[PDB]
Amino acid sequence: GPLGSPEETVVIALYDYQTNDPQELALRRNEEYCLLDSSEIHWWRVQDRNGHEGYVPSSYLVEKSP
């Protein structure tokens, strides 16, 4: 891993989110997600701990800043 990502921020899922289409991803209560794109609560691009990235609601995600 010589290079990194534009967004080294993480977010925590507040509630189990569920999408209707494959375009977006689902969230899981008490879980972290590697934030990639955060333009607005409308859609937040994050990545799971498996290697997949998708869109999710920011309203159900908290900025992991301990």
SS3 11: strand
Residue with tokens 């507040």: 14
The Cβ of residue 44 has, within 10 Å, a number of other Cβ atoms equal to: 24
Domain boundaries defined on the chain: 1-66
- Experimental method of this PDB entry: NMR
Q: Which CATH number fits domain 1-66: 3.30.70.660, 3.40.50.2020, 3.30.950.10, 2.30.30.40?
A: 2.30.30.40
Distances (CA, A) of 50 to 32, 39, 40, 42, 53: 11, 23, 24, 24, 9
